[PDB]
């Protein structure tokens, strides 16, 4: 259902109640789905030392194949949508309307690269709460997919060509946001947890950590076929639901393979006083809310009467 409403509505994807909703919902779809052989969660309730809550539990080998989820209005509210083809979360929306439920969202937990998500209709879009704040995540949305193929054999494949063309579009949009005379450089992550340093995700129920350096090592505005990224399947990971650790059983299948569409990127720029005419961007991510937020940026829950 849809009903084009004629009036000026205000949006803000950085403070979208629905996101937290999705966040807690997904964390729950996970907990009942992907169970660890053991999870460790901190617990330093003041006291002297720190107690560590540890759970040892059944560890059935299964995979995460969630069905798309539609979010409808919660008792007492309604869902408004910004029909504008190119709208960046923060700001007023002229072409707005009421909707029954959201479009189907394929929940995907991962880092650096947003998979199987919505594509931008017009040109490429880059959203942030403050492009000026180099510490804030930049959500890049593509207008064109790019297939990423991975295997439990140890790698992920991607068109050197397609990925190339997609980067040009990104730096294009970027220099635009900062400086025309600026140069856009794409370097690898600066560091931190494994999950954040590498393009991490779960395929066939296993946790992949794939080195994305090859995807972020280029400068713009200043044989050859496929790009192979080395992955690694880990059994001990850092939880994303909360500060914690989890251990899973070793793989049981010798043929683990997944194909996804890269439909968005989570970037972060190295601000500082570089005082040059070039900005440096790196794969970011970690806060799954940005993932949810990349699909929900066009909705808002409104208290109805």
């Amino acid at each position, epitope marked *: 259902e849809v009903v084009l409403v004629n009036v000026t509505e205000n949006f803000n994807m950085w403070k979208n109640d629905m996101v937290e909703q999705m966040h807690e919902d997904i964390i729950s779809l996970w907990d009942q789905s992907l169970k660890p*052989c*053991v999870k460790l969660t901190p617990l330093c309730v003041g006291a002297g030392s720190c107690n560590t809550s*540890v759970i040892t539990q059944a*560890c059935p080998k299964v995979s995460f194949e969630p069905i798309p989820i539609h979010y409808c209005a919660p008792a007492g509210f309604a869902i408004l949508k910004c029909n504008n083809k190119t709208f960046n979360g923060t700001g007023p929306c002229t072409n707005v309307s009421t909707v029954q439920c959201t479009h189907g969202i394929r929940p995907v937990v991962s880092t650096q690269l947003l998979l199987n998500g919505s594509l931008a209709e017009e040109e490429v879009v880059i959203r942030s709460v403050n492009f000026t704040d180099n510490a804030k995540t930049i959500i890049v949305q593509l207008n064109t997919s790019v297939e990423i193929n991975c295997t439990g054999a140890g790698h992920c494949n991607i068109s050197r060509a397609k990925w190339n063309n997609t980067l040009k579009q990104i730096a294009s949009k970027l220099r635009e946001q900062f400086g025309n005379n600026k140069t856009i450089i794409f370097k690898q992550s600066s560091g931190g947890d494994p999950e954040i340093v590498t393009h991490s995700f779960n395929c066939g129920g296993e946790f992949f*950590y794939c080195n994305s350096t090859q995807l972020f090592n280029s400068t713009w505005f200043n044989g050859s076929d496929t790009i192979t990224l080395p992955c690694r399947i880990k*059994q*001990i990971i850092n939880m994303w639901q909360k500060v914690g650790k989890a251990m899973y059983a070793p793989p049981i299948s010798g043929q683990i393979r997944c194909s996804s569409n890269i439909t968005g990127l989570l970037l972060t720029r190295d601000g500082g006083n570089s005082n040059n005419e070039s900005e440096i961007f790196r794969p970011g991510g970690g806060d799954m809310r940005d993932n949810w937020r990349s699909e929900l940026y066009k909705y808002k829950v409104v208290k109805i009467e």
Partner: antibody, heavy 128, light 110 residues
Framework: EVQLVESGAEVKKPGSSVKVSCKAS????????FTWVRQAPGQGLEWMGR????????HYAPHLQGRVTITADKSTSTVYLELRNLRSDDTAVYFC?????????????????????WGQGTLVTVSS | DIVMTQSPATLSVSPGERATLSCRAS??????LAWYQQKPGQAPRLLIY???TRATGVPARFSGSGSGAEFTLTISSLQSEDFAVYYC???????????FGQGTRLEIKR
């Protein structure tokens, strides 16, 4: 491959508690899981429990649940076994054993159950 | 409560001949089954794990097969040093509550 050097023979009265140790050397300590196994004179092997050095988590045998604790100080590459409320039937040789798990430091952990590296064993006599 | 059981309590084999050791389980264990050899006054020695993989330094005359609740330890040609006690161990369950067979004593028959 790591070498398992166990502490010396113990002599205790029933009701007492003991703490036997095992020094691991030769490889990256946190890349192995350690298990304690005991054997009473003239009898077979009895699995007591195992610890996942990396996670610092441990699991014990049921009949043993309660009065046993296995630990490890990642600084001295030492594994410790502690048995409370000793009983005369607890008299046995206590074996410390280990197996390689992969690069735990890198998140790889096969969670291997078998035991490849063993210690000389520690005799622990419980008697009045 | 997974219980392992070794068939022959004592196997009397003539030197140079073959010997087959039996170990069954009261419940399925897939292939998480290991074998150990133990000489008097010594720590056990791992021979086979994963039911059939020979462990480093273990001669080829030693071989393991089976899965589920029935396992076999076959020593092709018994050597003077092969006489000892052998134990099987199931490490299938989770939480870990691994167990041992009561052992089979391999003795020189004369």
């Amino acid at each position: 491959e790591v070498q398992l050097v166990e502490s010396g023979a113990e002599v205790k009265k029933p009701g007492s508690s003991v703490k036997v140790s095992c020094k691991a050397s030769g490889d990256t300590f946190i890349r192995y899981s350690f298990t304690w196994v005991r054997q009473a004179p003239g009898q077979g092997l009895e699995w007591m429990g195992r610890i996942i050095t990396i996670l610092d988590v441990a699991h014990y045998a049921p009949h043993l649940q309660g009065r046993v604790t296995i630990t490890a100080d990642k600084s001295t590459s030492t594994v410790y076994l502690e048995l409370r409320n000793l009983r005369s039937d607890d008299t046995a040789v206590y074996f410390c054993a280990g197996v390689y798990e992969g690069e735990a430091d890198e998140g790889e952990y096969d969670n291997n159950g078998f035991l490849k590296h063993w210690g000389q064993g520690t005799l622990v006599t419980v008697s009045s | 409560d997974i219980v392992m059981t070794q068939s022959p309590a004592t196997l009397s084999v003539s030197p140079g001949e073959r010997a087959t050791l039996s170990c069954r389980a009261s419940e399925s264990v897939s292939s998480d089954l290991a074998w150990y050899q133990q000489k008097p006054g010594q720590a056990p020695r791992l021979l086979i794990y994963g039911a059939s993989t020979r462990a480093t330094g273990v001669p080829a005359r030693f071989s393991g097969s089976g899965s589920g609740a029935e396992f076999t330890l076959t020593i092709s040609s018994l050597q003077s040093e092969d006489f000892a006690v052998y134990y099987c161990q199931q490490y299938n369950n989770w939480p870990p509550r691994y167990t041992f067979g009561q052992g089979t004593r391999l003795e020189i028959k004369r």
